[PDB]
Design a protein around this ligand. Sequence first.
Ligand SMILES: Nc1nc2c(ncn2[C@@H]2O[C@H](COP(=O)(O)OP(=O)(O)O)[C@@H](O)[C@H]2O)c(=O)[nH]1
Ligand SMILES: [Mg+2]
Lengths: 292, 205, 105, 405, 117, 37
Amino acid sequence: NRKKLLLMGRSGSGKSSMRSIIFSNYSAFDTRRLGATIDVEHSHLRFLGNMTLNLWDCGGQDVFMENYFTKQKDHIFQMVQVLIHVFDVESTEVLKDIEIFAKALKQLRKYSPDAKIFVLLHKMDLVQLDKREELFQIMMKNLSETSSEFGFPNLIGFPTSIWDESLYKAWSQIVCSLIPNMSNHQSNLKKFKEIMNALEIILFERTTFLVICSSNGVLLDPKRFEKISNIMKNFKQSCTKLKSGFKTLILNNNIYVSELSSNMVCFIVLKDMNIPQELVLENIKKAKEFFQ
Amino acid sequence: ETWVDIKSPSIPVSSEFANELLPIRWKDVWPKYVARKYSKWRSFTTPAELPITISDFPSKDDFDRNFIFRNHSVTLNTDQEQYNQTYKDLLRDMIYMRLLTGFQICVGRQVEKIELSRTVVNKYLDFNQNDAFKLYLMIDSEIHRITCSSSGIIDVERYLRKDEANLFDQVPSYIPLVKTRYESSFRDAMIDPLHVKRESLNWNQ
Amino acid sequence: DCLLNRGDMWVLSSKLVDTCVFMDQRLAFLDSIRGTIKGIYRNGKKIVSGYIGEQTRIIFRSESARLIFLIQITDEMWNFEETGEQLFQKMVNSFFPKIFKKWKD
Amino acid sequence: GFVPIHTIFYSVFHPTEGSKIKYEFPPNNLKNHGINFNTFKNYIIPKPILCHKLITFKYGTYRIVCYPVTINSPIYARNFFSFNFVFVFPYDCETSPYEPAITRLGKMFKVLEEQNQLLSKSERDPVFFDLKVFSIQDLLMRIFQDLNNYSECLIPIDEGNAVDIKIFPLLRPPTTCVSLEDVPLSSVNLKKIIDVNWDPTMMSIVPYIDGLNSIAKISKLSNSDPGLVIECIRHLIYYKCVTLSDIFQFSNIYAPSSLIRNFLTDPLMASDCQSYVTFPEVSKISNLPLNKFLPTRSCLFDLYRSLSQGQTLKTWYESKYMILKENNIDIRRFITFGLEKRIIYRCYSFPVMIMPKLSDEEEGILEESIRNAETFDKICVLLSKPKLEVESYLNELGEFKVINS
Amino acid sequence: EIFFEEENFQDINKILEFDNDFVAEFCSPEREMCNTRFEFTVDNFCFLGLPIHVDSQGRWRKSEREKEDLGKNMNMFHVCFVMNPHLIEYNKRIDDMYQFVVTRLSLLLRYVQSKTS
Amino acid sequence: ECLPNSCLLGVHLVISTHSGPQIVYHYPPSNTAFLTN
Ligand SMILES: Nc1nc2c(ncn2[C@@H]2O[C@H](COP(=O)(O)OP(=O)(O)O)[C@@H](O)[C@H]2O)c(=O)[nH]1
Ligand SMILES: [Mg+2]
């Protein structure tokens, strides 16, 4: 179960910043000290307990980018499952970025045409708040007209930044496109939701704290998953100060955050506030071996 | 002696006598058993001051070969006891002024051997418990011993090392040419480096 | 960054008697002078904490001191070493930058 | 000989357009000769695990030597500034002498870049800097031309910095099997080489080097420890000046070698052999009886081949004494010329086991020498006694035999 | 057995103060620097070998299901010898090691990989 | 030098899959201090 993810972009696009924050556990202020990635940096990251991710943090500078599509084209773009192209909105060479993306799409269509393309419009915190979404539209349409040209009828894009929680949503949806047996996880989560009579049950990953699945797939915030992921990353970094690891968290006897297994974390919001804690904890412990 | 006479450079070291080739005045900065391979960069980065204590002293024959003898007797007047200054404060000030010139306080075995062949020698100075202090100080020029009692009559005996045939008169005059940073021509130095020396202070006054 | 007289070192050592210290303990003298116990030795061992007695050879190293350099310019400065380096090239390219980096560190 | 440099180029890491050849001399040499800076660009500008090291690799027929340097400071953009002064040589040479020069050049320019940013500001581009808080081409031309022509350079780059390079040949380290029974020769005149910077021991060893003094004899004569004499002789061997030889006795087993034909095939060996082996006058030693005008080259060749493996010098000299008397031949010089020209060798004597009362130290070193199968020469040197006394002492100690190898 | 003593052991992930990922990176050349000598020197450490790389097609040479997957996915294998010859005998030791050991071993390995993986 | 000395320290088997280069087997796991000295 080896998944080959490519992480490409232009110079200074922030690819290694995403790789460090999501997986290597770096803060937002600690990405300024990062150097320039030379050629391709490989990272073998173990997701859940069975998945292994071969993330290829590519260079992004002009010599490396010209080298990718001429000499190493038979190596970087073969047996590829997911491409993640990072577009910087601070770039003044947007047409060159679109041409680089077109060459990457052409190579992927030539070699491994079953892959999944994702685009992240990074550094979307320097732009003013009023012109963000429209800008995300204005590029994306063009990218769609590019993406449908070289095969690939579908292309999913995300307005991302390292100073908010959108990175977690983008990376969660990128990673979840590779997780096997998602239907079984959804069915078991629905069964547990019916059994415990819970308002919403969300299943994460323990290390990266990315969302894996949700019970639902009073109006609630549509961006609650990424906010909970950011809050849990902050709480893990806070609990590292006490020389220990986070295990459980009970809020108002209504919100239970529990270590479901050695690779997942469950976030259960129930309906009745009068349930004793031990019954919910026991039912959590019974389902610990079920999701394994 | 300031040098050891090697018989020949072609003969090897005798046992491990090279570790005994250390200055006597700076011998106390090194630890008892830590090797010298560690204190290399520490001399450059963080230079060490001259220690207060000295662990060497002349033997009995050296005091009867080349030395002389003087005598002091000091006791503060009634004017200084108008302020809160007793004989202990005078002794502390006198030891303070014996220092700042290069003096080193003598505590160890040789000083005790000299003291017996004439009770407790002191290194620090505590006015609360003890009430009578005796301590030696040593530079190459002269060796002081300061004794005190409850009577307040502080006694200082100084043994001056006599000069050997006027070494500062047997060396030729040597005036180099010094060019400083703001100068542009090599002028003449205004001091003879060889004939300037730390002079023996008149400690009585 | 502070001027202690030799007698000031003597007095500060006199106040540090029958008092136990440890590593990196910032002592204070006259509420302004700062110290740092960077090393306690006993029987050849660098102990973390130690007891200072009447016969403890306490030393006062200075981290801000005056230094004089005397460089000999001779006929040998332009000579070559066996590897292929001039001696003044070693002096101005390997000795002084290293000592300044160590002083800043 | 020193290999000429083929191409020298200065590479820098641009934060937008990547690693590239900033300058190169000769111009368009890499592209004309086939070298491509898209295959080994990851070694010229590497990740900071290979930096500050002497990377030397092979590209086709060209050996590429470089010392990449990466400087970490917040002043430069992306917190790093990477460069490399890369030298290219043909593969079929020895790049050994140029490696310390390249390493020192890289270290010096790293020091200057850390000091006053001599290389970063020379690009005249603010993209190399954060922007929030001297010609390299002429220097490369001068380095290339001066190292190809003179093997030296004193190229000035500023008011206080100069690229100062001299290329020295690499020499083999000397032997470690030098002992107390080996006499040192001197193919060079050591009197005129002594200057003020010599070791004090090497000054004293020089007068007592004449082809007949043993190292123990030199040590006792010059009042020196034998170990420092051993080290000084090793230093003199290191410069190819002093070659060891054997102690000359009249009980040695000198034998012809496989190079005796060099006494005929070398046109300038026999002519010097006539003048070398002859006494300056009619010496009295050529007039003593066996018991009581220059030599012909055929005579000398017949005397060289008369030696044999088992005929000691006493037996050969008393079997050929009219020839060495009429021709006025010094036997010690006769043997030493053959040993220096490697036309005869010595068959060593080995006392393998099967008188005055010597002291405990002498008998201890005697037993230690016998247990290690040391030659008669070393035992004689250590005991300060001749061969006959040593043989009598050994026969008193136990039965033994002599091997002449 | 001396290579596995406590005073003479290092972790599997580290080779001569270098990680396995970095060594596998810089001992894996491009296509232009493969199928030939790879005499690479860092600092008194010659990494020497004859990398064998697949051609434009899937051909290695011209005349459990993870095993077949790795056989169809691998494109290069390299047998790298680490040497530390002295500076005066580099051109002899490296040349004889490449001529007598590395070349024949790597060519036989390429042949056996070409016929039966 | 006629004395034979094959100055060898170890071997690596480095393969390059499509998931990146990797080391499969290196025989001597000793450190630099024991190997060089
Ligand atoms: N302000 C801001 N800076 C960013 C953002 N993303 C990346 N960066 C900057 O990008 C720099 C590092 O870029 P890097 O990951 O090395 O780019 P890469 O090498 O092309 O992957 C850091 O100094 C960050 O300050 C962002 O969303 N906002
Ligand atoms: Mg990067």
